Amino acid sequence: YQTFQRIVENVNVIISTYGEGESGPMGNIMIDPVLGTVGFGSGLHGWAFTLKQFAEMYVAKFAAKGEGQLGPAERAKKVEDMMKKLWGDRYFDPANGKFSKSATSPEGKKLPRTFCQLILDPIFKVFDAIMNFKKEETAKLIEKLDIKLDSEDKDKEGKPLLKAVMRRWLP
Amino acid sequence: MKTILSNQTVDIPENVDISLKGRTVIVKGPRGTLRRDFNHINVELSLLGKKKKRLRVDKWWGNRKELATVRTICSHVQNMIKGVTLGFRYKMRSVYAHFPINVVIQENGSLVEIRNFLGEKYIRRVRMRPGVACSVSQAQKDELVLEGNDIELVSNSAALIQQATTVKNKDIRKFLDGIYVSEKGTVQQA
Amino acid sequence: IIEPSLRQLAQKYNCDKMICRKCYARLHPRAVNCRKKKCGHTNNLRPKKKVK
Amino acid sequence: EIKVVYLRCTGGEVGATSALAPKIGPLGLSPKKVGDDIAKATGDWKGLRITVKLTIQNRQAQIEVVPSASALIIKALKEPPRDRKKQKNIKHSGNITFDEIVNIARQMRHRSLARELSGTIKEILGTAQSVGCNVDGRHPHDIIDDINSGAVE
Amino acid sequence: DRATWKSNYFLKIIQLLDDYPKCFIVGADNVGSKQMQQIRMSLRGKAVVLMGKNTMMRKAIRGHLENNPALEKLLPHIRGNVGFVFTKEDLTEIRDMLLANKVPAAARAGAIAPCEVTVPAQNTGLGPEKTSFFQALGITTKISRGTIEILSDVQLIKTGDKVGASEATLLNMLNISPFSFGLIIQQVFDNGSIYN
RNA sequence: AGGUGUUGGUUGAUAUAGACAGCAGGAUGGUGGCCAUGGAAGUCGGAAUCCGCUAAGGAGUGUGUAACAACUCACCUGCCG
């Protein structure tokens, strides 16, 4: 995360160096991961994503709502608040329950980053489970993540299975 | 010329109890027992004083080349006493550029499964010395603590896993990879 | 790509060594003579050409 | 915004061997006008390179004559304006006026980084022998002349 | 050479001890030559600071025991870095001026720090540098409008903490001098009576 | 050609007013001394190689910069002898 933050900072140094239009002739041309510009993915398998899909996905799980899909309203403001709180130093821990602004815990412990725990930690777990071939983990994993498999990819395991799961999970 | 006498007294503590028999001593204390033979140098030992408080060594009528080997044996004896009382804790880290070095311990602290050394499929099994207890400790990236009694055995167990990482006949100026010794100390604090 | 302190620690053991003229022996950089019989303990030494 | 910078200009002749581009580049004011103003403000120096300070204001910079050690000595050893091709061995030698030495040492006391006129006269005459000259004798004679016979103020 | 200078130092110490029967014992720790010159800009002539080898001080005091018995208890007070300050103006003003005229400077990577390193909330006033030297040590640096501002005032080097080489470059880049190095007075000698 | 391989002579000095180790601190202001050089400040060249200021700081020992910047040393201090 700090490595990609330094990459975005170096791109911002390039923009501030060679910017002939500075904040109003051209506009806000600085790269921002909050708006959904910085794209994370790997095209060798096929999976690639932005922040907007996870900002739409995690607000349905935690904690509200469907429900009023139209229109430019409280739902869209909650999605923008979620993609704002994912980027930056906004720590989260399930023992606390609610949000926390400080870096240290009120009990006096370490607080993980939400961009680690909510996003990259289940991605590391699904890569670990697929590369280690654990059927008792991946059965409940498919049952949780709702992976639609109706072909011979149940029997075919390994790298084509990983590619199919990643392409179905993140188009 | 032959110098007649050059003594060197050693003030051993009460916790280190020794009992010489010829040129073979035994060392006991809080933990660890170490023995070493001294027949090759052919010197004279003298354990004097009531309740065995200090040791004395002699080298009668030896020249400049033979008196130089007397002071180093005192340093080896002091290192042995330090290994018996305090010990030796060697901490060391791993350095990689692109491919990480998979380090894990097998056979209860006597073998290291070195895997994936800079993209090489060959694996190495560097066995530790008898007596040295290797332990991969937590809260670090790569942290192998080495603990044991004898300084020669502990430093040999450090040197094997230090110089096991060798790049055969390439540019060592650009290729900067290898596991090396960084920290040296004792097991318990004095 | 590499830690600078660990990089200098790697430079201390391997690269930072004086090189003899005749036999090109690897010597510690606090020496006045060589340690090889094949050269004859040549006092002339050279620093190793570092990477730029 | 006040910025202080040194410009070591030739003053007298047209000094082409110089590199003063990154200093007043992104500011906006031309450095050639500043160099011409320094060369006009020197006037009677004509031979030496002097690290002139620039009190850069908001509108334009100001001119402050910096009293140098060797440059005031070779200024006191007055010369006609020489050629532009700058042939070597341009250092002069002769008789320096003691009143001119006092006039330089008063500017050195206004600079105020030494002893009360004595360290200033001695540090001028120490550079005088490094250039190569004599004021009725060299610097070992000047040490004798300063003790109990010089006009100590 | 040195043999004439060593004998001239005896003339210096006998002249100063015959001129001024009142002195201050100071200790100079990690002071610079420019800092000592800026001290002498204030204490140029009225206060003469003298230094030398402690054994030659001991021999000089053993020599002055034959002439003046009032210089008695200067022998056990020579401990560590001892320096004499010859002055005959006042005892209560110079001890405050020596505390007042401490010259600020940056700390050297390798020595201990007497004070705590603090970074105030102020922009750099330059182009956008990298954050690898700042964010790795612990200080969180938020980037807003070119210049990098410091939000969290995280103390890096504490009292007695070892100064590192990587954390010494950021202070030189930010041009911050929080420390105040100088001499520390140890003993006060006032006419055959040592006070503290 | 030599070799801190070892055995022996001569010269030169530092030395209990504390030399040799070994561990730390500065290593200055005029000044960026001058000529010339695309830059010479200590770092392509040629002549000067002196003062205030000490306890001491060379018109700067070396590494490195386009010039600077950065780092290190002789000469000088704290501990042991």
From TrEMBL, chain E:
Q: What family is this?
A: Belongs to the universal ribosomal protein uL10 family.
* Protein purpose: Ribosomal protein P0 is the functional equivalent of E.coli protein L10.
Q: Which gene encodes it?
A: RPLP0
The organism's lineage? Eukaryota, Metazoa, Chordata, Craniata, Vertebrata
Which terms in the GO cellular component ontology are assigned?
A: cytosolic large ribosomal subunit
Name this protein carries in UniProt: 60S acidic ribosomal protein P0
Organism equals: Carlito syrichta (Philippine tarsier)
Q: Which residues does the UniProt record annotate as the domain Large ribosomal subunit protein uL10-like insertion?
A: 107-176
GO MF term set: large ribosomal subunit rRNA binding; structural constituent of ribosome
A single GO BP: cytoplasmic translation
Secretion signal span: none
Q: Which UniProt keywords apply?
A: Phosphoprotein, Ribonucleoprotein, Ribosomal protein
